[PDB]
């Protein structure tokens, strides 16, 4: 079912996505250990992910949540980083992209900071780095993040001091 | 997978301490997210 459609760099949609990657990079408390030392990205490609059946699965749940929450889905655009990007875009998110050891228990994690999702591209804590060079700060290897539509509905607020 | 806190659909990790961090979020049902964009990129070495 899944099709990847390239966006031209001239498309305003390419631009607004890139602006959200670039402008949400921050410095991390690990000094770069997990995700590398950088202040910005070289964006190589952006593809729109098109799967009718996954999209309907999403809108169906969205309508449920919305009707449980005074017609407010509380939909956001958030980043997700994972070594299983290719499975996610073909088969969707489910419990095998859960982070069972996470700060907020076992579920699927998303971030407003692009650089936070970048720490997870090669696994938890960056794993062993890129497959080719074993380098969590590799400047050569191509990485992939997802930018995702996420239904939050009524959100449990947890403080993390 | 674990369940959402009762009466809730998601968890928002509000950052405290690190005044610059943005939030993280957790959902407990895969149908609550759709992967709209696949971004292929490299990190850049700072000048
Ligand atoms: Zn590499």
What would you say this structure looks like, in words?
- Chain A: It is found in: Cytoplasm; Golgi apparatus membrane; Nucleus; Chromosome, Telomere.
- Chain A: Belongs to the ARTD/PARP family.
- Chain A has about 160 residues and is of the alpha+beta class.
- In chain A, about 25% of the residues lie in helices and about 25% in strands.
- Chain A has a single domain (about 1-160), classed as Phosphoenolpyruvate Carboxykinase, domain 3 (Alpha-Beta Complex).
- Chain A has a two-stranded antiparallel ribbon with strand order 1-2. In chain A, strands 3-5 form a two-stranded antiparallel ribbon.
- Chain A is globular, with a radius of gyration of 16 Å.
- Chain B has a single domain (about 1-45), classed as Other non-globular (YefM-like fold).
- Chains A and B meet through strand 2, helix 2, strand 3, helix 3 and strand 4 of A and strand 1, strand 2 and strand 3 of B.
- Zinc ion binds near residues 132 and 138 of chain A.
Q: Any idea of the CATH topology of chain A?
A: Phosphoenolpyruvate Carboxykinase, domain 3
Distance between the termini of chain B: 43 Å
Q: Any guess at the CATH architecture of chain A? A: Alpha-Beta Complex
How much of the polypeptide of chain B forms β-strand, as a percent range?
35-45%
Alpha plus pi helix count of chain B: 0
Overall domain count of chain B: 1
Q: Quaternary status of these chains?
A: heterodimer
Tell me the fraction of residues in β-strands of chain A, as a range: 15-25%
Strand order of the largest sheet of chain B: 1-2
Order of strands, widest sheet of chain A: 1-2
Which structural class matches the secondary elements of chain A? alpha+beta
CATH topology of chain B: YefM-like fold
| Overall geometry of chain A | globular
Which series of helices and strands of chain B comes N to C? EEE
